[PDB]
Amino acid sequence: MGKYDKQIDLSTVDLKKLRVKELKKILDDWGETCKGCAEKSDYIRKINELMPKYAPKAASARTDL
Numbered sequence: 001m002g003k004y005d006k007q008i009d010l011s012t013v014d015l016k017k018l019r020v021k022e023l024k025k026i027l028d029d030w031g032e033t034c035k036g037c038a039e040k041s042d043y044i045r046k047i048n049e050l051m052p053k054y055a056p057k058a059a060s061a062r063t064d065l
Contacts, residue, residue, distance in 0.1 A: 010058045015044045023047060030054045
């Protein structure tokens with residue numbers, strides 16, 4: 001098997017590598033979006049604020065074991 005391996009990626013994604021439109025997607029999927037935000041890093045803050053509320057599958061840190 002190759003080219004496809006998973007049905008989720010928010011568990012392992014890098015919000016710094018994404019763009020504002022891709023951060024807006026994560027926020028809109030939970031139904032929760034900022035209204036005075038104007039910089040890419042503030043959408044990363046609004047995600048990390050709400051990821052433990054709606055995505056325990058991604059709020060937890062990685063482990064080598």
